[PDB]
Write an enzyme that holds these catalytic residues in place. Structure first.
Site, PDB file in Angstrom:
ATOM      1  N   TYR A 473       0.871  -1.177   0.000  1.00  0.00           N
ATOM      2  CA  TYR A 473       0.000   0.000   0.000  1.00  0.00           C
ATOM      3  C   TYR A 473       0.924   1.249   0.000  1.00  0.00           C
ATOM      4  O   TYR A 473       1.184   1.809  -1.054  1.00  0.00           O
ATOM      5  CB  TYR A 473      -0.948  -0.073   1.210  1.00  0.00           C
ATOM      6  CG  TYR A 473      -1.930   1.059   1.307  1.00  0.00           C
ATOM      7  CD1 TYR A 473      -3.094   1.073   0.512  1.00  0.00           C
ATOM      8  CD2 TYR A 473      -1.716   2.112   2.203  1.00  0.00           C
ATOM      9  CE1 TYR A 473      -4.007   2.128   0.623  1.00  0.00           C
ATOM     10  CE2 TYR A 473      -2.619   3.175   2.323  1.00  0.00           C
ATOM     11  CZ  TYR A 473      -3.769   3.152   1.555  1.00  0.00           C
ATOM     12  OH  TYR A 473      -4.677   4.197   1.680  1.00  0.00           O
ATOM     13  N   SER A 554      -6.297   1.198  -4.201  1.00  0.00           N
ATOM     14  CA  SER A 554      -6.457   2.616  -3.828  1.00  0.00           C
ATOM     15  C   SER A 554      -5.079   3.238  -3.963  1.00  0.00           C
ATOM     16  O   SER A 554      -4.516   3.303  -5.059  1.00  0.00           O
ATOM     17  CB  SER A 554      -7.088   2.812  -2.418  1.00  0.00           C
ATOM     18  OG  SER A 554      -7.596   4.167  -2.205  1.00  0.00           O
ATOM     19  N   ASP A 641     -17.787   3.702  -7.136  1.00  0.00           N
ATOM     20  CA  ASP A 641     -16.628   4.038  -6.309  1.00  0.00           C
ATOM     21  C   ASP A 641     -16.495   5.565  -6.271  1.00  0.00           C
ATOM     22  O   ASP A 641     -15.827   6.195  -7.128  1.00  0.00           O
ATOM     23  CB  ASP A 641     -15.324   3.376  -6.806  1.00  0.00           C
ATOM     24  CG  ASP A 641     -14.184   3.643  -5.867  1.00  0.00           C
ATOM     25  OD1 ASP A 641     -14.387   4.457  -4.931  1.00  0.00           O
ATOM     26  OD2 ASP A 641     -13.099   3.026  -5.999  1.00  0.00           O
ATOM     27  N   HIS A 680     -15.992   1.497  -3.572  1.00  0.00           N
ATOM     28  CA  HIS A 680     -14.571   1.397  -3.299  1.00  0.00           C
ATOM     29  C   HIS A 680     -14.180   0.067  -2.669  1.00  0.00           C
ATOM     30  O   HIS A 680     -13.037  -0.388  -2.821  1.00  0.00           O
ATOM     31  CB  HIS A 680     -14.153   2.539  -2.375  1.00  0.00           C
ATOM     32  CG  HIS A 680     -12.674   2.781  -2.346  1.00  0.00           C
ATOM     33  ND1 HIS A 680     -11.928   2.987  -3.493  1.00  0.00           N
ATOM     34  CD2 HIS A 680     -11.815   2.889  -1.313  1.00  0.00           C
ATOM     35  CE1 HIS A 680     -10.663   3.195  -3.156  1.00  0.00           C
ATOM     36  NE2 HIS A 680     -10.567   3.135  -1.839  1.00  0.00           N
TER      37      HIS A 680
HETATM   38  C1  LIG Z   1      -7.439   4.873  -1.013  1.00  0.00           C
HETATM   39  N1  LIG Z   1      -6.300   4.702  -0.489  1.00  0.00           N
HETATM   40  C2  LIG Z   1      -7.957   6.324  -1.015  1.00  0.00           C
HETATM   41  C3  LIG Z   1      -7.195   7.062  -2.120  1.00  0.00           C
HETATM   42  C4  LIG Z   1      -5.965   7.657  -1.456  1.00  0.00           C
HETATM   43  C5  LIG Z   1      -6.433   8.020  -0.058  1.00  0.00           C
HETATM   44  N2  LIG Z   1      -7.621   7.186   0.133  1.00  0.00           N
HETATM   45  C6  LIG Z   1      -8.371   7.169   1.243  1.00  0.00           C
HETATM   46  O1  LIG Z   1      -9.381   6.456   1.312  1.00  0.00           O
HETATM   47  C7  LIG Z   1      -7.955   8.110   2.362  1.00  0.00           C
HETATM   48  C8  LIG Z   1      -6.827   7.632   3.250  1.00  0.00           C
HETATM   49  C9  LIG Z   1      -7.506   7.105   4.498  1.00  0.00           C
HETATM   50  N3  LIG Z   1      -7.894   5.714   4.155  1.00  0.00           N
HETATM   51  C10 LIG Z   1      -7.178   4.772   3.548  1.00  0.00           C
HETATM   52  C11 LIG Z   1      -7.967   3.638   3.490  1.00  0.00           C
HETATM   53  C12 LIG Z   1      -7.505   2.367   2.825  1.00  0.00           C
HETATM   54  N4  LIG Z   1      -7.636   1.169   3.641  1.00  0.00           N
HETATM   55  C13 LIG Z   1      -7.151   0.074   3.082  1.00  0.00           C
HETATM   56  O2  LIG Z   1      -7.349  -0.104   1.892  1.00  0.00           O
HETATM   57  O3  LIG Z   1      -6.347  -0.867   3.877  1.00  0.00           O
HETATM   58  C14 LIG Z   1      -6.512  -2.290   3.867  1.00  0.00           C
HETATM   59  C15 LIG Z   1      -7.509  -2.698   4.952  1.00  0.00           C
HETATM   60  C16 LIG Z   1      -7.011  -2.780   2.510  1.00  0.00           C
HETATM   61  C17 LIG Z   1      -5.162  -2.936   4.155  1.00  0.00           C
HETATM   62  N5  LIG Z   1      -9.163   3.883   4.078  1.00  0.00           N
HETATM   63  N6  LIG Z   1      -9.151   5.221   4.526  1.00  0.00           N
HETATM   64  C18 LIG Z   1      -8.718   7.992   4.667  1.00  0.00           C
HETATM   65  N7  LIG Z   1      -9.114   8.176   3.258  1.00  0.00           N
HETATM   66  C19 LIG Z   1     -10.073   9.117   2.973  1.00  0.00           C
HETATM   67  O4  LIG Z   1     -10.167   9.582   1.855  1.00  0.00           O
HETATM   68  C20 LIG Z   1     -11.077   9.423   4.063  1.00  0.00           C
HETATM   69  C21 LIG Z   1     -12.122  10.420   3.577  1.00  0.00           C
HETATM   70  C22 LIG Z   1     -12.882  11.019   4.763  1.00  0.00           C
HETATM   71  C23 LIG Z   1     -11.943  11.847   5.637  1.00  0.00           C
HETATM   72  C24 LIG Z   1     -11.841  11.569   6.991  1.00  0.00           C
HETATM   73  C25 LIG Z   1     -10.971  12.305   7.805  1.00  0.00           C
HETATM   74  C26 LIG Z   1     -10.214  13.340   7.243  1.00  0.00           C
HETATM   75  C27 LIG Z   1     -10.354  13.631   5.884  1.00  0.00           C
HETATM   76  C28 LIG Z   1     -11.221  12.885   5.087  1.00  0.00           C
END
Ligand SMILES: *[C@@H](N)[C@@H]1CCCN1C(=O)[C@@H]1C[C@H](n2cc(CNC(=O)OC(C)(C)C)nn2)CN1C(=O)CCCc1ccccc1
Length: 710
Positions: A473, A554, A641, A680
């Site tokens: 990642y 992502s 997504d 997503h």
């Molecule tokens: C995917 N990585 C997307 C695109 C780049 C950033 N992103 C997010 O979703 C971004 C980072 C934080 N995040 C990452 C993930 C991924 N999880 C994951 O895939 O891990 C495994 C379990 C598969 C190993 N989930 N969240 C948060 N995120 C956001 O965009 C959150 C939006 C809402 C928010 C909340 C707080 C502050 C700002 C925005």
């Protein structure tokens, strides 16, 4: 092998933008409109070639059958007490959605409380967030449709599971926090916008507000409690302190682990919650994270990274709040990251550390911070926990690469603590004793040692002959810790593969310094780290380039796509799920503005110059050398997504097919699949999950010509 033709895709050769004197052509810009007949026809034409390619070889059905069998095991969450009752999630094995159960005691008969499966034919309505009232008698829950981040909040009375009339719309990225008087609940909503708000739109999300909904009223009556009209990207989430006295507002701007922290002493409101609250701006900047743990009167315990990149616990007294006066309750460790902390049974703290990418769990005294007890664990991750301040017991769930999971329970009223297995499930068909997990540390380009987990069959010869699946990642302070994946173990057992997970920079594995090592001007470290993981696997004889698949989702989709452009010679196969591919435009859509804290933003010349070097969309290039082509590539995305808008994958695939796919030397396929009624990934129903992993491993099997091993 390639008995299909890529579709003809119009190039708008007029689409040219100046970025600080650098001209960039974007001939597929039209794919940014998800509602056009042109885009719809593009998606249909792409799916028309991908689906028969994936379905052609019997291996997909063999994989799907084995996935369906091996994934069919019971899946529980931790129990958690709310008021007078216990709750837990449970899936008998292959239900599309896990179901929330309720029981009157641990020894008592359980009954269904909320079953999301009955909300759609295909399991595409999913729970997304929930909050019980403080007394446990009322329940609010978010529902998302077709995998969108958009939420509708609904309400039930717990006794008799009675649906209530209250419905909250326009909810996204929301808190859910009931006042302890039971009168109503804080939540977040966005203002009305033109066009659709169903997850198919690309519209940027700005001006999130904090509202208070009084139970038994219409949403139109809700009270506006905080707004930031001069700061459209700010997002203020509310929580109540454990004693119900204070509303704590954590304001975020972007994805960095930092927040402002304001509070409202509710006893100081002139007449209850009637409008903008009397916020006291305790921490009024974005210099550090302050994550509420508990309070005793005006002494508030927070987890923080303020001047402590591995995190620590501090006590701030609201009556003596200057930073020089804060007490360090549990100091920062030199290397181990304090991942999360909970307060339970009034005066205990449960601390979860990450030590070289494996979890440890400790009980500490609230008053002194002293260590009281180590909860013993095998090597792996803690992926679930329950135990709040007024509760007298904890549950926690452990998982690892080879073990589906163990839920432990500990009664904290006992003088001598004895944590015990509460629930365990074994997956028959995957004998864990046949495999091993090793952790190694390999040097990156710049000499930094990067952790990597490798999972393989015991006794294998390191002769380069095995297919490998290397996952990464690398961003957003996310740590990639051990987890049970039936889909990947099937690759090991039935495709003779080696699994590897590289803990590259940008993640949280070594705290904030690890995260800063993989962002902004140093984003290229992520790619270097990952390319070096592949080089290690090859040099040490686990695999060879033609047998190596890389995968990420992502930000991990960005990872593998960039790696395909930079070192096409290193990989046989690339699967990029829901990837951020257009680094120049990502900030324009939905919540992408929040990612600039990891990436930068192309509105800055300095940032543009970083982004242009690695942006997958802008770095598709035929390899110079006659004997090198691009790896086989599969992009997976879905039409709802709204986290990573699917235009990223659409424009990228059009570019790969035109620049590389048209070349005579390119014989490896470059394909996209766009799913329907999905987003997503969160809340994706089991049926769709099984189809997705079957597509992934069928692609790998066909491209690499791997025989199934029954
Ligand atoms: C995917 N990585 C997307 C695109 C780049 C950033 N992103 C997010 O979703 C971004 C980072 C934080 N995040 C990452 C993930 C991924 N999880 C994951 O895939 O891990 C495994 C379990 C598969 C190993 N989930 N969240 C948060 N995120 C956001 O965009 C959150 C939006 C809402 C928010 C909340 C707080 C502050 C700002 C925005």
């Amino acid at each position: 092998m390639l008995s299909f033709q890529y579709p003809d895709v119009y190039r708008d050769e007029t689409a040219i933008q100046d970025y600080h004197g650098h001209k960039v052509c974007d001939p597929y810009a039209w794919l940014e409109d998800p509602d056009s007949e042109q885009t719809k026809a593009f998606v249909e034409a792409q799916n028309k070639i991908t689906v028969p390619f994936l379905e052609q070889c019997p291996i997909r059905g063999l994989y799907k059958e084995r996935m369906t069998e091996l994934y069919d095991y019971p899946k529980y969450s931790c129990h958690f007490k709310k008021g007078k009752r216990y709750f837990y999630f449970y899936n008998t094995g292959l239900q599309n959605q896990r179901v929330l159960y309720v029981q009157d005691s641990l020894e008592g008969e359980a009954r269904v409380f909320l079953d999301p499966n009955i909300l759609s034919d295909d399991g595409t309505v999913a729970l997304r967030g929930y909050a019980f009232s403080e007394d446990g008698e009322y329940f609010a829950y978010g529902l998302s449709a077709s995998g969108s981040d958009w939420v509708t909040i609904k309400f039930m009375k717990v006794d008799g599971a009675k649906e209530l009339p209250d419905v909250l719309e326009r909810v996204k990225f929301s808190c859910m926090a009931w006042t302890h008087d039971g009168k109503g609940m804080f939540y977040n909503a966005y203002p009305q916008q033109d066009g659709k708000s169903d997850g198919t739109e690309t519209s940027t999300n700005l001006h999130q507000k904090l509202y208070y909904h009084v139970l038994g009223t219409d949403q139109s009556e809700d009270i506006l409690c905080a707004e930031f009209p001069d700061e459209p990207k700010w997002m203020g989430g509310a929580e109540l302190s454990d004693d119900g006295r204070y509303v704590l507002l954590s304001i975020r701007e972007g994805c960095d682990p930092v927040n402002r922290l304001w509070y409202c002493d509710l006893q100081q409101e002139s007449n209850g919650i009637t409008g903008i609250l009397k916020w006291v701006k305790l921490i009024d900047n974005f210099e550090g994270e302050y994550d509420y743990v508990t309070n005793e009167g005006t002494v508030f315990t927070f987890k923080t990274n303020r001047h402590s990149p591995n995190y620590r616990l501090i006590n701030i007294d609201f009556t003596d709040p200057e930073e020089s006066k804060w007490k360090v309750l549990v100091p920062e460790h030199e290397k181990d990251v304090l991942e999360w902390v909970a307060c339970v049974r009034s005066n205990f703290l449960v601390l979860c550390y990450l030590h070289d990418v494996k979890n440890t769990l400790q009980l500490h005294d609230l008053a002194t911070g002293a260590l009281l007890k180590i909860f013993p664990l095998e090597v792996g991750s803690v992926v679930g926990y329950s135990g709040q301040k007024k509760d007298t017991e904890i549950f926690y769930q452990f998982t690892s690469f080879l073990s589906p999971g163990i839920i432990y329970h500990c009664d904290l009223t006992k003088e001598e603590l004895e944590p015990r297995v509460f629930r365990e499930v074994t997956v028959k068909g995957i004998d864990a004793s046949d495999y091993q997990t090793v952790q190694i540390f390999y040097p990156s380009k710049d000499g930094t040692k990067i952790p990597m987990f490798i999972v393989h069959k015991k006794g294998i010869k390191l002769d380069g002959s095995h297919p490998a699946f290397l996952y990464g990642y690398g961003g957003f302070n996310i740590s990639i810790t051990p987890n049970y994946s039936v889909s990947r173990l099937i690759f090991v057992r039935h495709m003779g593969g080696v699994l590897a997970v590289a803990n590259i920079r940008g993640g949280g594995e070594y705290g904030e310094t690890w995260h800063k090592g993989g962002i902004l001007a140093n984003k290229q470290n992520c790619f270097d780290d990952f390319q070096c993981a592949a080089e290690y696997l090859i040099k040490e004889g686990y695999t060879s380039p033609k047998r190596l698949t890389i995968n990420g989702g992502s930000n991990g989709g960005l990872l593998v796509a960039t790696c395909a452009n930079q070192r096409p010679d290193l990989f046989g196969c690339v699967i990029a799920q829901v990837g951020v591919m257009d680094m120049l435009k990502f900030h324009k859509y939905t919540i992408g503005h929040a990612w600039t804290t990891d990436y930068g933003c192309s509105d800055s010349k300095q940032h543009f110059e970083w982004l242009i070097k690695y942006s997958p969309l802008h770095n598709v290039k035929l390899p110079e050398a006659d004997d090198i082509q691009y790896p086989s590539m599969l992009l997976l995305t879905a039409d709802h997504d709204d986290r990573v808008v699917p235009l990223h994958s659409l424009k990228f695939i059009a570019t790969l097919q035109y620049i590389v796919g048209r070349s005579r030397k390119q014989n490896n396929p470059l394909l996209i699949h766009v799913d329907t009624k999905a987003g997503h990934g969160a809340g994706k129903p089991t049926a769709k999950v099984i189809e997705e992993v079957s597509d992934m491993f069928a692609f790998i099997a066909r491209c690499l010509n791997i025989d199934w091993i029954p």
